[PDB]
Coordinates of C-alpha atoms in Angstrom, one line a residue:
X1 CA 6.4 17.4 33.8
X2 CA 7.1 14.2 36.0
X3 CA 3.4 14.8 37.9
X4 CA 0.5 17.0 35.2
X5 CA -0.2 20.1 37.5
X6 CA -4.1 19.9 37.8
X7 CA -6.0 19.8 41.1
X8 CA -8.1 16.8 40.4
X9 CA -5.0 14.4 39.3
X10 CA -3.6 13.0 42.1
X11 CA 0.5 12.6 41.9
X12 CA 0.0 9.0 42.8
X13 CA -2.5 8.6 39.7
X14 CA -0.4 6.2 36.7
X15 CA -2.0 8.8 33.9
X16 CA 1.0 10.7 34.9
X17 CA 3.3 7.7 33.5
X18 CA 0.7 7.5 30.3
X19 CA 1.0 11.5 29.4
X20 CA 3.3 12.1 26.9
X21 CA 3.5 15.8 26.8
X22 CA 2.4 17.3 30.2
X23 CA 3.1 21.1 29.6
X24 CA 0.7 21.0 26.5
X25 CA -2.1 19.5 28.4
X26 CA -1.4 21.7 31.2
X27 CA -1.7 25.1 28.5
X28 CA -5.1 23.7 26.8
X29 CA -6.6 23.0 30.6
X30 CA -5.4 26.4 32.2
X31 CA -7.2 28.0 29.0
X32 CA -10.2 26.2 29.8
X33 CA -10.1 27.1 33.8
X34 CA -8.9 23.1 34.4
X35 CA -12.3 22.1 33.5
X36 CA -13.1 18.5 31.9
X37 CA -12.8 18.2 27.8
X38 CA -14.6 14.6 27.7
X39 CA -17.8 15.1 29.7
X40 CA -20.1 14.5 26.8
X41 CA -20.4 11.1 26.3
X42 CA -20.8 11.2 22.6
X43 CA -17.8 13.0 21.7
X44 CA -15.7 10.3 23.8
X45 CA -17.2 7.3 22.1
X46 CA -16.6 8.9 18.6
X47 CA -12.4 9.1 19.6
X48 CA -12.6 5.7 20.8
X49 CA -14.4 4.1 17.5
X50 CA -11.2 6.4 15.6
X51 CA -8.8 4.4 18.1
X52 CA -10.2 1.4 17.2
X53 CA -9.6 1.7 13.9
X54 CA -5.8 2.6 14.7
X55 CA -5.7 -0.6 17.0
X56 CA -7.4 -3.1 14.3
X57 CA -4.3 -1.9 11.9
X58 CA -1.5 -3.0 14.1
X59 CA 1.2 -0.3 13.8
X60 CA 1.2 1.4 16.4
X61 CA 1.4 -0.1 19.9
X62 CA 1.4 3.8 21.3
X63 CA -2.2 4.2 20.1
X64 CA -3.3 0.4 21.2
X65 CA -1.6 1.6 24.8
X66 CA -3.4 4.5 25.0
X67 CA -6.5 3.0 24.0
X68 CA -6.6 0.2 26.4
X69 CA -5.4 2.7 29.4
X70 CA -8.4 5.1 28.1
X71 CA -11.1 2.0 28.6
X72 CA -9.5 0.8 31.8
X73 CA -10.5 4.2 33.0
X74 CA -13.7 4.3 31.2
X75 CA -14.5 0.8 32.9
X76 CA -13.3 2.0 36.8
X77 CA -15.7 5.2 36.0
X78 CA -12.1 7.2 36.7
X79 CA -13.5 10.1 34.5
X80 CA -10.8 12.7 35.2
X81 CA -7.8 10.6 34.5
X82 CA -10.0 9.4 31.1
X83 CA -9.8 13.3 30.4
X84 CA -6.2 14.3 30.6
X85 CA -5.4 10.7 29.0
X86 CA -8.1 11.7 26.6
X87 CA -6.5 15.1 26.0
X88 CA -3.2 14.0 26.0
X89 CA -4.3 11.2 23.1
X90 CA -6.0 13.8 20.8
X91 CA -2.5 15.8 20.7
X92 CA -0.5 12.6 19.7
X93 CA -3.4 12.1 17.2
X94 CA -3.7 15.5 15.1
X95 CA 0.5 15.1 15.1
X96 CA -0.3 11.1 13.2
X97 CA -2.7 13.0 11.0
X98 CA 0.0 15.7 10.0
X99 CA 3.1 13.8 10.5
X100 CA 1.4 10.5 8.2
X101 CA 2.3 12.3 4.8
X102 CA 5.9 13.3 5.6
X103 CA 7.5 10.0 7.7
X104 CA 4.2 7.9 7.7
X105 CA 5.8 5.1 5.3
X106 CA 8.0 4.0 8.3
X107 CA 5.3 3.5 11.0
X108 CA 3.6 0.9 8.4
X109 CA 6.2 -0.5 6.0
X110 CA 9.9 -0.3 7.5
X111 CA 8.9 -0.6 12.0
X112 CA 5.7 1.1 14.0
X113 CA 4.5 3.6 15.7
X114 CA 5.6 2.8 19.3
X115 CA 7.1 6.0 20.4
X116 CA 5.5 9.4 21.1
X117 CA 5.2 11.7 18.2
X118 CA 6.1 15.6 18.4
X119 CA 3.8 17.8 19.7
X120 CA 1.2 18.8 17.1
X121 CA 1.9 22.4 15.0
X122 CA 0.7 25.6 16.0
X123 CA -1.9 25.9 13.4
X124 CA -3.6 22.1 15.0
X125 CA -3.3 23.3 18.5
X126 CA -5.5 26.3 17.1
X127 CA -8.1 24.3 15.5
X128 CA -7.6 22.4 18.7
X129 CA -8.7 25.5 21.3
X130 CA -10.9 26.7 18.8
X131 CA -12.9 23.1 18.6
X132 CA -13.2 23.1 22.5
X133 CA -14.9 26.5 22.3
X134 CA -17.3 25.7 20.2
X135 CA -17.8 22.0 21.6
X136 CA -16.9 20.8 18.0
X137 CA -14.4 18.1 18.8
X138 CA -15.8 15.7 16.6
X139 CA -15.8 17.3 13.7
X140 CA -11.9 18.7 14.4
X141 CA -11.0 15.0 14.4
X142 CA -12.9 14.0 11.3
X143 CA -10.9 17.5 9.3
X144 CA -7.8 16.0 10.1
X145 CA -8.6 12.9 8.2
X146 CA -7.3 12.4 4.3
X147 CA -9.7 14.7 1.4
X148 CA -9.5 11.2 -0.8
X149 CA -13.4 10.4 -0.4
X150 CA -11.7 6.6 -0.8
X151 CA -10.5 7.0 3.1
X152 CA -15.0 7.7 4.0
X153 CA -15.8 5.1 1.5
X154 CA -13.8 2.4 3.3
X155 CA -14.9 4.0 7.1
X156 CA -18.7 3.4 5.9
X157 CA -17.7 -0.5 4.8
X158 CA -16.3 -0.4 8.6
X159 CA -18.8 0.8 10.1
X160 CA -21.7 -1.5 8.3
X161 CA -19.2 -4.6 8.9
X162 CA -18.2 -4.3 12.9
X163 CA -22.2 -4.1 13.6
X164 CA -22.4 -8.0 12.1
X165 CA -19.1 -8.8 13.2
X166 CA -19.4 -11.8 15.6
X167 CA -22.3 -13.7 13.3
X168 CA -21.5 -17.1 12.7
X169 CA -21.5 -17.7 9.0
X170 CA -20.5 -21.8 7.7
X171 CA -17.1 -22.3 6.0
X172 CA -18.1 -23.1 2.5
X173 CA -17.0 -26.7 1.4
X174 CA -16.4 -28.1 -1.7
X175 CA -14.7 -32.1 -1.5
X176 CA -13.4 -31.9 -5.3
X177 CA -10.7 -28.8 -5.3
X178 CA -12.8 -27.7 -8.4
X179 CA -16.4 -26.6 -9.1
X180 CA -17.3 -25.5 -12.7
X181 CA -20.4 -24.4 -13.8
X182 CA -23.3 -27.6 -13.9
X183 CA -21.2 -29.1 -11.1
X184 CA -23.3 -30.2 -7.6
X185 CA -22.6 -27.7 -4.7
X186 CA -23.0 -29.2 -0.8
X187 CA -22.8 -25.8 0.5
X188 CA -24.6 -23.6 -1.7
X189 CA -25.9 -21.4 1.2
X190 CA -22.5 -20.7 3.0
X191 CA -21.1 -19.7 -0.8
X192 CA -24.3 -17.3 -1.2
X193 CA -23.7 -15.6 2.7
X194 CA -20.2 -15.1 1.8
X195 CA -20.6 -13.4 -1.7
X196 CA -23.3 -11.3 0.2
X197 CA -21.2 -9.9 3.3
X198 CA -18.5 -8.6 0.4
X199 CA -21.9 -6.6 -0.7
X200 CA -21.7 -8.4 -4.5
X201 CA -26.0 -8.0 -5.8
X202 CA -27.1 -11.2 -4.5
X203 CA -30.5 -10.6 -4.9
X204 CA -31.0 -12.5 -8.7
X205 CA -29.0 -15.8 -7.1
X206 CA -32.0 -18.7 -7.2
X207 CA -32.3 -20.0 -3.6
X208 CA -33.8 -23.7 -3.8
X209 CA -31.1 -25.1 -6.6
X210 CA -28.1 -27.3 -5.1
X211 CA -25.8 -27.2 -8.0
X212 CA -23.2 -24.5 -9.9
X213 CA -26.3 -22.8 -11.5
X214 CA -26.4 -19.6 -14.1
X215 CA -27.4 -17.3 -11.9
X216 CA -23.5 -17.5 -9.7
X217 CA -22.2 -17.6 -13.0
X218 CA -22.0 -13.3 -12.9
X219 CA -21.4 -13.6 -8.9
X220 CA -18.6 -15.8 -8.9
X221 CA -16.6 -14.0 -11.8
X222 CA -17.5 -10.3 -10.0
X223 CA -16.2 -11.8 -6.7
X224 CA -13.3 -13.2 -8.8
X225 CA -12.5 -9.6 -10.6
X226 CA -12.7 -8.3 -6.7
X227 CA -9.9 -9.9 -5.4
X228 CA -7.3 -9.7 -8.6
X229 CA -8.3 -13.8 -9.1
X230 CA -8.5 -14.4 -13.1
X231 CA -12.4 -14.8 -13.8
X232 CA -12.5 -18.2 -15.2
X233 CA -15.5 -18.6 -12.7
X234 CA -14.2 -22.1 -11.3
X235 CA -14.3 -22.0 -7.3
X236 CA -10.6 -23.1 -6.8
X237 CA -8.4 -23.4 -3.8
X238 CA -8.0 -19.3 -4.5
X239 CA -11.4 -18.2 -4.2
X240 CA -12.2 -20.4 -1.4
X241 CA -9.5 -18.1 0.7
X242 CA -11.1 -15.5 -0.3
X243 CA -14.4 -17.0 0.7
X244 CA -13.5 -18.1 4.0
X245 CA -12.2 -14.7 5.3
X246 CA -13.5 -14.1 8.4
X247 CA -15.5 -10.3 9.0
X248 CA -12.5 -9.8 11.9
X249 CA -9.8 -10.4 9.2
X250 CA -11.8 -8.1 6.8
X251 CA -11.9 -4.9 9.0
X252 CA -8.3 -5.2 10.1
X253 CA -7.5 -5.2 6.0
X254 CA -10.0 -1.9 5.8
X255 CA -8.5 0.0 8.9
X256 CA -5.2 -0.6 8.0
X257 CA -5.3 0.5 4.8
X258 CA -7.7 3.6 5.5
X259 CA -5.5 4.4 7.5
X260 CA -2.6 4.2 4.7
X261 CA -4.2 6.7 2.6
X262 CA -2.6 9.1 5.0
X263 CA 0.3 8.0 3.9
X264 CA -0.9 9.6 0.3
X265 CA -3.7 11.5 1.0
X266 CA -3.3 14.1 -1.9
X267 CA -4.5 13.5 -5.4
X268 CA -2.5 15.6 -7.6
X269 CA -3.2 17.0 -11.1
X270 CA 0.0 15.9 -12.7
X271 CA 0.8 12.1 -11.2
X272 CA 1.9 8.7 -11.4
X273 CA 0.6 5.9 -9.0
X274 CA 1.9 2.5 -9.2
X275 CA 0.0 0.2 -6.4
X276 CA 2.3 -2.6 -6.0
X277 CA -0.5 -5.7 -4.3
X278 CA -3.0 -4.2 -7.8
X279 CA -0.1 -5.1 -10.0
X280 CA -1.0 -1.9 -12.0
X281 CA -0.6 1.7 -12.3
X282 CA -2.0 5.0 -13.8
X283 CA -1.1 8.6 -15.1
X284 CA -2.9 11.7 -14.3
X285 CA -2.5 15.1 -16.5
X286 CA -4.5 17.8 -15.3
X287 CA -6.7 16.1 -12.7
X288 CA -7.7 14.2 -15.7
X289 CA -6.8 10.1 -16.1
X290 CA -5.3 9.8 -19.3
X291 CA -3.4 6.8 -18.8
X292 CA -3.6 2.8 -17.4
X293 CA -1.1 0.0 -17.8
X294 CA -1.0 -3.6 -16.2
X295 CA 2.7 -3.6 -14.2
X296 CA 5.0 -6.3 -13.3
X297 CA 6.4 -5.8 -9.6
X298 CA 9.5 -7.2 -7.9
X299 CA 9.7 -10.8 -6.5
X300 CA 9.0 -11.3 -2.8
X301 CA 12.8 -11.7 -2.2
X302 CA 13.4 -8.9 -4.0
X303 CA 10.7 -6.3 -3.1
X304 CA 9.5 -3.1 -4.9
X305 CA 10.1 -0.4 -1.9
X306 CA 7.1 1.7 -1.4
X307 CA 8.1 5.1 -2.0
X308 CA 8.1 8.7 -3.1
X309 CA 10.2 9.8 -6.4
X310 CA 9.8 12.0 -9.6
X311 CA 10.2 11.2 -13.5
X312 CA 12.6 13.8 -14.7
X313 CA 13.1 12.1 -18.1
X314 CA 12.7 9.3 -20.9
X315 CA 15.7 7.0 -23.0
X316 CA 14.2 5.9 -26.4
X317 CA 16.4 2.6 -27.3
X318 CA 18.0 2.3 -23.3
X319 CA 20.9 0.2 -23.0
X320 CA 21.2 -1.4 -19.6
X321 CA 23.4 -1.0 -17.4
X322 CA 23.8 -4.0 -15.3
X323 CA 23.7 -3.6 -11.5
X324 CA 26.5 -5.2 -9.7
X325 CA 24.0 -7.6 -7.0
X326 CA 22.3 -9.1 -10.7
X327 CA 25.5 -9.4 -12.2
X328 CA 27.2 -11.5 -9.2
X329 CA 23.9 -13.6 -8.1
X330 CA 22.1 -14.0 -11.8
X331 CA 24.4 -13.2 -14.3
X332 CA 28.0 -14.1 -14.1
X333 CA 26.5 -17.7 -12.5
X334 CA 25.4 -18.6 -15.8
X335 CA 28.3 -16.5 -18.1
X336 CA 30.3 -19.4 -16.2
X337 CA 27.6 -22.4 -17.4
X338 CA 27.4 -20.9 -21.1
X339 CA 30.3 -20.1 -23.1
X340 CA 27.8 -17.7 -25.4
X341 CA 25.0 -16.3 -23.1
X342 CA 26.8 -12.9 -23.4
X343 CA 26.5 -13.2 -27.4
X344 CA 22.9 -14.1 -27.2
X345 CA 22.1 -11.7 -24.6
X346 CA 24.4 -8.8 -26.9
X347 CA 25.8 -8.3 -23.2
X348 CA 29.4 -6.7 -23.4
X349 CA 32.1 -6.9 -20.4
X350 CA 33.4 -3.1 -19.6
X351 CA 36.3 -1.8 -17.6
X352 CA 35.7 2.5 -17.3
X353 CA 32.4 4.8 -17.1
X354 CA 31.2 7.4 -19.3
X355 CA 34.0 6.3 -22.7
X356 CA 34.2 2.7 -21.4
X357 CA 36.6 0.0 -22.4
X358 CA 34.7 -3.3 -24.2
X359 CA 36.8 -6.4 -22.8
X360 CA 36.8 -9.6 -24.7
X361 CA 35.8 -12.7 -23.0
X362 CA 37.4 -16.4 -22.9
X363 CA 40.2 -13.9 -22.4
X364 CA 39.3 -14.4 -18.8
X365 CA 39.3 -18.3 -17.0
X366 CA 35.2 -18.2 -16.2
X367 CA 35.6 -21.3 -13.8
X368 CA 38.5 -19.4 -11.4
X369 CA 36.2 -16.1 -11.5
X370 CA 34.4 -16.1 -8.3
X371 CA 31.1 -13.7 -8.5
X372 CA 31.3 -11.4 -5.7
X373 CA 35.4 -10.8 -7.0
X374 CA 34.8 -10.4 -10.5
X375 CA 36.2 -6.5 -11.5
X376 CA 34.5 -5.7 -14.4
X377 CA 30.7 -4.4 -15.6
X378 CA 28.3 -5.7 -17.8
X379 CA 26.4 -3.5 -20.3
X380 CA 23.3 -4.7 -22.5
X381 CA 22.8 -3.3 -25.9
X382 CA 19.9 -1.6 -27.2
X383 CA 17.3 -3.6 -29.1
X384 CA 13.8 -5.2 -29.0
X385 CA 15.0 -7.9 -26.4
X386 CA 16.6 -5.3 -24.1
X387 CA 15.6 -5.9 -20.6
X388 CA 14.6 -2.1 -20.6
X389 CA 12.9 -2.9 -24.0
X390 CA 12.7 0.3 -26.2
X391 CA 12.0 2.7 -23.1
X392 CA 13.4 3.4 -19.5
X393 CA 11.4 5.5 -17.7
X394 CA 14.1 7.7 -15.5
X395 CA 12.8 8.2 -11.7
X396 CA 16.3 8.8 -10.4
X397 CA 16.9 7.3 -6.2
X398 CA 19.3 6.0 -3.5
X399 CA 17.4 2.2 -4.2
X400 CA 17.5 2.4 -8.8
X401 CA 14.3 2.2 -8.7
X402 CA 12.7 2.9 -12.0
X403 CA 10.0 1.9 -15.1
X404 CA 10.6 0.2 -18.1
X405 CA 9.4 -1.8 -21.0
X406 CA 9.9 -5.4 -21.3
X407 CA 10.0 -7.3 -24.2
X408 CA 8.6 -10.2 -22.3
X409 CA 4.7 -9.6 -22.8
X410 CA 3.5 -12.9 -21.7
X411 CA 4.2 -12.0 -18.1
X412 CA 0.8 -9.6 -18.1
X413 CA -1.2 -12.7 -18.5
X414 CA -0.5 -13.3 -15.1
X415 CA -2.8 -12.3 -12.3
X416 CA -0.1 -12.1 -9.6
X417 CA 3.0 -10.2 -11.4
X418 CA 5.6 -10.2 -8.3
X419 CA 8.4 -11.3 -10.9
X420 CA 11.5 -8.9 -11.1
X421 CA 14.8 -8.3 -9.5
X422 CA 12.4 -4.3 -7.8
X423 CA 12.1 -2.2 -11.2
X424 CA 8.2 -1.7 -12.7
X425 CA 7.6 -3.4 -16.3
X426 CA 5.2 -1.3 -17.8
X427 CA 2.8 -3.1 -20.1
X428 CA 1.6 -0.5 -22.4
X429 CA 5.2 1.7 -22.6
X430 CA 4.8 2.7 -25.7
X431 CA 1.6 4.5 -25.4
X432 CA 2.7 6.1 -21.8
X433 CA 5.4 7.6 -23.8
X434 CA 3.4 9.1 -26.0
X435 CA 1.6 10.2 -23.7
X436 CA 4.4 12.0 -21.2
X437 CA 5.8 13.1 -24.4
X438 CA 2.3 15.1 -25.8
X439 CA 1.5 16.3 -22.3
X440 CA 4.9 18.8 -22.2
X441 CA 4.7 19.5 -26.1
X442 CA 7.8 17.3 -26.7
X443 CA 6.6 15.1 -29.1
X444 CA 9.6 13.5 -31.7
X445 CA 9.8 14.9 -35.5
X446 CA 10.7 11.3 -36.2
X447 CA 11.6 7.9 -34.3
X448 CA 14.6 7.8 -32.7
X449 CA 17.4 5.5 -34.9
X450 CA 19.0 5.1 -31.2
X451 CA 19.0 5.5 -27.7
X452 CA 18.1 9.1 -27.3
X453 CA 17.5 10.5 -24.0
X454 CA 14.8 13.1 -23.4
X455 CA 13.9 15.4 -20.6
X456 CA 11.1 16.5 -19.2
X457 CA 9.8 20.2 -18.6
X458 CA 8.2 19.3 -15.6
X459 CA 9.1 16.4 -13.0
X460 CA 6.0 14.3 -12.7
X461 CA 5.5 12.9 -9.0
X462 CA 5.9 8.8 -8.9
X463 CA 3.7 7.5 -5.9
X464 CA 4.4 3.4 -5.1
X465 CA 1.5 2.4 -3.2
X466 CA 0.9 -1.0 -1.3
X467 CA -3.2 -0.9 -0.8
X468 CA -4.8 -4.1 -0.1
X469 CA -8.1 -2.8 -0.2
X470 CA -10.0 0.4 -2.5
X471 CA -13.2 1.7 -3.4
X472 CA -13.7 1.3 -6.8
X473 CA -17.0 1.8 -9.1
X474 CA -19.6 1.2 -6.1
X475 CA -17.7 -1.6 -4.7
X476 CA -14.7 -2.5 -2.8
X477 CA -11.9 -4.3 -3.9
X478 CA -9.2 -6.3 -2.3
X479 CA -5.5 -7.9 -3.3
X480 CA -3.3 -10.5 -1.7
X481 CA -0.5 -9.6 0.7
X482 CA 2.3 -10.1 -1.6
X483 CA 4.7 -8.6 0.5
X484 CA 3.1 -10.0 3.7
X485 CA 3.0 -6.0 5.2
X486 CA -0.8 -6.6 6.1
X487 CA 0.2 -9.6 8.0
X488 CA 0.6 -8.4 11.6
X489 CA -3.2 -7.0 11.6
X490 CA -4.5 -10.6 10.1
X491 CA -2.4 -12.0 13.0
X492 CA 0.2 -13.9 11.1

């Protein structure tokens, strides 16, 4: 334990301080006659480019440690403590590959990664001895990576990116806030470098011109529809941002979020994914895509978690039930300022659950209630102008989380849809109901005259994502840190 019992470590050596699980390194060296694991050059360098990647995406401090230890080592040619390091590293890593899709959300969304995982399971330490054997360690580390070929696509785009890393490349400058098409450009060729390292076809784009010409007409709007910007094709204070990203700031958005797709690796045949920074979400029946919907998301101050949940079921007509935080900080503020926003909301008061009792207002003094005392519930009626609209989409958890319709439409024109109080507005709920409905063979004789409940046959898995960056169509595409979680690997 407190010293790695190998012949070649000294006690004195601080690799006995770095180890994390001695005993295991000691069982996969005594199998292998204490001999070194790392010898082949090749095979190290391919570990430390998959480290790299960790340490570009900021959470985890254990793997950033470890790395920097490893090339101290590398640096003083201390080969034999770079081994059992080594070693020792590679078990911490196949338990982040397995453990990422179980507890992963909290080492990137709720703290970090800064404390030793549990060993690996039996059936990686295996693949582990049985990789050694056949000096295969590369590929063993490359099979505990996600199946999503999204998680290779965004490692290529890594790969081509870090080689042209540290190429200086002008800020591109504009001096009126807005170019339009026929406007004069002063930095035309910074603009056409920076549509070109984001691999847009920049081939057709006229090189001699000095103005907002027809041929960045396409460009612009494709690098618009890239980052979630509307494609107006005006070069605002939005797409400059965009355009002045540095390459660094660019890999530390891919690694972190390749490295998130552990964090839902699986592509399911019966889903629902919801990627919170996309403002959208889709439905998949039978590995088949059968349904796509603009969402709206919660306000920054009040978050849509990223999480795991099912949909066991469906309310045609919902009423809502009003959640005591909305009623003390939204509602009862303005109950207080307007003697009929209850009437014009059809909200009703309510003192029981399950047979409730409907209490009459102005029977209560509104300027001596104080929010956070106030007794009573509120209850919305069902209609058109329901806050659930005509369907709640029931993904029953500890946080309420769920989907709805909204009869506020004019919210989807938005590009940046961060707006409610944590629950997802569906755009198109009408249609995914249909849909859910068709797909378990419980489609309605008639419309419901009320609210009517229905459940599902089958629970259908509800993934909430938060993916900055995707491969999508050839290309890939990126979204702004709503929630500021890809913050700490900008360096903000």
């Amino acid at each position: 334990q407190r010293f790695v019992e190998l012949g070649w470590i000294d006690s004195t050596s601080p690799v006995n301080e770095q180890i994390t699980n001695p005993a295991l390194v000691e069982q996969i060296y005594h199998s292998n006659n204490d001999q070194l694991l790392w010898s082949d050059l090749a095979t190290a360098n391919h570990f430390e480019a998959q480290l790299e990647v960790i340490h570009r995406a900021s959470f985890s401090p254990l793997f950033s440690r470890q790395l920097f230890a490893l090339k101290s080592y590398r640096q003083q040619d201390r080969w034999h403590e770079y081994d059992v390091l080594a070693t020792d590293t590679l078990l911490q890593y196949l338990s982040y590959a397995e453990q990422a899709p179980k507890v992963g959300i909290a080492w990137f969304f709720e703290g970090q990664l800064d404390q030793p995982l549990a060993p690996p399971s039996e059936e990686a330490q295996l693949a582990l001895h049985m990789a050694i054997g056949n000096q295969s360690l590369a590929r063993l580390m490359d099979e505990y990576t996600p199946q999503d070929p999204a998680y290779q696509q965004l490692l290529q785009a890594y790969q081509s990116l870090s080689s042209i890393e540290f190429n200086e490349v002008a800020l591109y400058e504009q001096m009126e806030r807005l170019k339009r098409p026929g406007d004069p450009l002063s930095h035309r060729e910074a603009l056409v470098q920076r549509l070109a390292l984001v691999n847009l076809d920049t081939t057709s784009i006229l090189n001699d011109v000095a103005y907002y010409d027809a041929s960045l007409e396409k460009p612009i709007k494709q690098f618009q529809k890239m980052h979630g910007l509307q494609t107006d094709g005006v070069i605002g204070p939005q797409t400059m941002k965009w355009l002045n990203t540095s390459v660094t700031e660019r890999l530390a958005l891919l690694a972190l979020n390749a490295e998130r797709i552990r964090l839902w690796p699986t592509q399911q045949d019966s889903m629902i994914v919801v990627n919170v920074p996309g403002f959208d979400m889709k439905y998949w029946d039978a590995g088949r895509e059968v349904f796509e919907s603009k969402v709206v998301v919660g306000k920054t101050t009040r978050p849509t978690p990223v999480m795991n949940t099912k949909l066991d079921s469906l309310i045609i007509n919902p009423t809502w039930n009003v959640p005591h935080k909305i009623m003390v900080e939204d509602i009862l503020p303005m109950v207080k300022r307007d003697s009929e926003y209850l009437a014009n909301h059809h909200m009703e008061i309510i003192r029981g659950w399950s047979d409730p009792e409907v209490i009459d207002p102005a029977l209560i003094d509104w300027e001596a209630v104080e929010p956070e005392t106030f007794p009573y519930r509120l209850r919305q009626q069902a209609g058109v102008q329901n806050a659930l609209g005509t369907y709640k989409f029931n993904t029953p958890n500890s946080r309420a989380i769920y989907l709805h319709d909204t009869p506020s439409k004019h919210l989807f024109n938005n590009a940046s849809r961060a707006f409610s109080s944590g629950c997802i507005r569906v755009e198109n709920a009408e249609k995914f109901a249909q849909t859910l409905l068709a797909n378990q063979g419980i489609t309605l004789d008639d419309f419901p005259v009320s609210t009517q409940a229905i459940a599902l046959k089958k629970r259908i898995p509800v993934h909430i994502i938060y993916q900055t960056v995707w491969y999508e169509e050839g290309v890939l595409h990126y979204r702004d840190d709503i929630y500021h979680y890809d913050a700490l690997a900008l360096g903000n």
